[PDB]
Amino acid sequence: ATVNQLVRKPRARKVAKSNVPALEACPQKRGVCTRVYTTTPKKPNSALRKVCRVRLTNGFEVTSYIGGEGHNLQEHSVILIRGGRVKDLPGVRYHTVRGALDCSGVKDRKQARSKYGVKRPKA
Amino acid sequence: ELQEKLIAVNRVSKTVKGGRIFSFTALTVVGDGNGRVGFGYGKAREVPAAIQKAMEKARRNMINVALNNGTLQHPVKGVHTGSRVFMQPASEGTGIIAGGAMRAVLEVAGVHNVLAKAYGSTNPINVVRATIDGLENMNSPEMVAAKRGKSVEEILG
Amino acid sequence: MVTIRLARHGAKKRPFYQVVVADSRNARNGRFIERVGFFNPIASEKEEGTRLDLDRIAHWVGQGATISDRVAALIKEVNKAA
Amino acid sequence: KIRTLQGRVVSDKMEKSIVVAIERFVKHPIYGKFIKRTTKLHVHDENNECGIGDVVEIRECRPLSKTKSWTLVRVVEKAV
Amino acid sequence: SMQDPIADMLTRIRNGQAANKAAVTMPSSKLKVAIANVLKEEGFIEDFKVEGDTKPELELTLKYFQGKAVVESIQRVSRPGLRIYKRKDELPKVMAGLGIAVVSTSKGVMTDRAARQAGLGGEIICYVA
Amino acid sequence: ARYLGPKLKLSRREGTDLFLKSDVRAIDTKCKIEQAPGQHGARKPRLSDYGVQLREKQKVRRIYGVLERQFRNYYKEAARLKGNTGENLLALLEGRLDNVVYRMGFGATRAEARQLVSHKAIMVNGRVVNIASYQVSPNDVVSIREKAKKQSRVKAALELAEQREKPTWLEVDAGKMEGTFKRKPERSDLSADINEHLIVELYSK
RNA sequence: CCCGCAGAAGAAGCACCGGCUAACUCCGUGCCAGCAGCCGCGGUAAUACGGAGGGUGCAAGCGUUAAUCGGAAUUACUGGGCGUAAAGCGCACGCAGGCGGUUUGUUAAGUCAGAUGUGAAAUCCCCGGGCUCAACCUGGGAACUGCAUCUGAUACUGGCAA
RNA sequence: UAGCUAGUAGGUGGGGUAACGGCUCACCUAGGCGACGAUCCCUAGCUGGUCUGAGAGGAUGACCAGCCACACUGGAACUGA
């Protein structure tokens, strides 16, 4: 492109689009569990993945994954929502922070406890 | 005495009536560590035989580069297919700064201090060719003085 | 009123006053017309405890600048040491 | 001895005033191509001696009107 | 149309070298004569001459060394669209000094080395290596 | 803030003697030096170039007892300084007070020298220095304090000191237990099986 | 800050180990539970799930998420393209704008050189100095690529004249 | 978002201010700005600087410092350098 053309119409960089719009540039957000259910993943994989719909403190209502084996969540349980998508589940772009707020930790977990809110075993 | 380094190993396949025939290709570079570098590329059904064919080919087809105390004479651009490489002389202590494909070639060549970067396609097979061509066209003050019909300092000083 | 005074910058428990000429209304560590030396209360006794460009100080004093008690003490002490 | 600008008169339809365009070369901040830029100034012209298209020499002065802050020092060339 | 005769000269040199021509000829000009003079003095060409009065033709006799062109790369820098001016301390050097940069200064056309040694800057006409 | 675990494990991982023991005994009579630690030590790793760079950096770090943050700051300072970056990095590493104490032989190992420094047993220009990373400068006098000079470990350590090769750039008077840091060591006087340029690459990857 | 007493005595965790990327086996599980940054795992010996042993990397921290730059030569001015991969208007004329053959003179606008003023202090950088070292504080300098004025140079671009 | 502007643009004279000035008046002239983006809308305190980057640049303006604006929202004057 000619320099003359550039001085007439300057280059205009694309604005990066975020992949986590509901967080509004916050690392976590609080929310209430509206419904807690299971869904099946994409064609290649096969499972019953645990998800929950959560209405955020900023009005946004979005679906979030519930990692780990076992959870005690029901309607009106307030949970902390963290960034991070789950690939084989379209529409779910958020994770639940295990061990934060009402959300409890994973039972008997020993390795990678800090990612699931499990206290250091007293042994 | 020459030092040889294997840059990349890749598995190719050919399809025939019965099915897929698997083979391997090997890209290697040999060097004298004092300004002479050659590259080789071999094919075989098994990896050790492919590497040995590549070594034998690499020993020939080798060229001389007029190094300057382990660094280049002047900045150089090289171009082959979509691989555009840029190299420049560097001060002592810098070491070898380059991508892997260029890193191996320069290390076996003996360039101790060089700043390099590859633009465009980083395909190792063509990056090596473009690096070799760039290093080959790089001339020295004595050769440029010989061409221009003058002395060294008459260009330097 | 133009005044000559110390702008303490230093660090915690280790002050390093900077003699500066400034309008008295501006904050202590703020706008200053001209710096005319430094003073370090803590001194290794081999360093320069106080440096003063007495000439510029005299220039501003003649122009009419007043002098803080501590800057007057510093000027008097350096002239006495000489 | 006196700071001064030189320009051409683009319009004189105002009473005792004229607008002069001062054009200069400036290296483009990024691309580099030297581009022409124009600055139009409302200038004070006693006697209305400046015709449109004339090339005039101007100097800065005190505010003379809401916009006028420059006075005509001399005409350089007129009625091209 | 024709709008950079110095570019035309450089391109004639480049294409004649590529085509292994012994000599090249082009419409002359004082600037072309000075650029040919600096090239000759720096030894990138054998010699040059001008023939005629009303439509002067300038002719450059090129030079080859090992079946190779002595001039490896000749490129215009300050093209008409974008003029490139440099100060005495900003004068570029080609191939870390192995090549030459042609500079037009207030004291005539000369190399970057000469301009630096004379403490002047100017318009970077072209690079030759 | 310091590595406290077993020491010969590191030497086994790096495949060479790191002088992590006093030396009185041949290391091969104390461990299987030529085999990597762990269940799968015997298998040999076809190690990538990044692996060899990491191994070189770890070797130097574990030789000098320096953790990653401090070593990174050392690299930044060496890069800032004029001259060969790797060479000034090695000079900075060899200028540590604990290393100087070990070279003058007051400690059988660098860890023992570090403990000596920490426990107010070393003086620099007649001043008590308790920081391991204190940079020693040319024409400095490092001395054992009188009160700590009667420790049996230092008199024991001087024998190992006289049994290892004597550095050129230090003048040690063992009788008075004092020494003079004549000059910064060059590259040539220290071991030549350290590939500092690998570290230079690793901190520019 | 220094001196004395006691006693190894009061003090090590976190992530990872299929490839990218340094570090591997056993047991449990059986496309379930589950993992995941991407590629991808899991349907009966799983180095990819969970536990153990071993190991690798950091360390009084370690990981996860969010945001910016980088890698991205992926807005390319330095530094990209347009026959078929996204990209030459259906074609022509033409105003504003961009560029312009060759010689002589003149101009000093652009350009170059020099000087002056100014570009606050702190921050970055260099040589040093003081807190036992460092962070930190601090002396002098460089820099602040700029802007304006004045005196010069006249090759190139521009103006004017032929 | 392609047109905007009647104290708007300029002038004479009077008034007002510490001061020049459509600052305000009375009258006269009918102009002024704009594709080198006026007007309109959205967004935002600016700078020395900070992060990043080989560099040019990209982002950013917390702490320190210089400047501006506001003091429940809207408006107004008084005292006073």
Ligand SMILES: [Mg+2]
């Ligand atoms: Mg399938």
Ligand SMILES: [Mg+2]
């Ligand atoms: Mg072949």
Ligand SMILES: [Mg+2]
């Ligand atoms: Mg590509």
Ligand SMILES: [Mg+2]
């Ligand atoms: Mg620490």
Ligand SMILES: [Mg+2]
């Ligand atoms: Mg590995």
Ligand SMILES: [Mg+2]
């Ligand atoms: Mg089973």
Ligand SMILES: [Mg+2]
């Ligand atoms: Mg896992």
Ligand SMILES: [Mg+2]
């Ligand atoms: Mg199994």
Ligand SMILES: [Mg+2]
């Ligand atoms: Mg596992």
Ligand SMILES: [Mg+2]
């Ligand atoms: Mg993230």
Ligand SMILES: [Mg+2]
């Ligand atoms: Mg970019």
Ligand SMILES: [Mg+2]
């Ligand atoms: Mg492209």
Ligand SMILES: [Mg+2]
């Ligand atoms: Mg197409």
Ligand SMILES: [Mg+2]
């Ligand atoms: Mg067509």
Ligand SMILES: [Mg+2]
């Ligand atoms: Mg023109």
Ligand SMILES: [Mg+2]
């Ligand atoms: Mg002409």
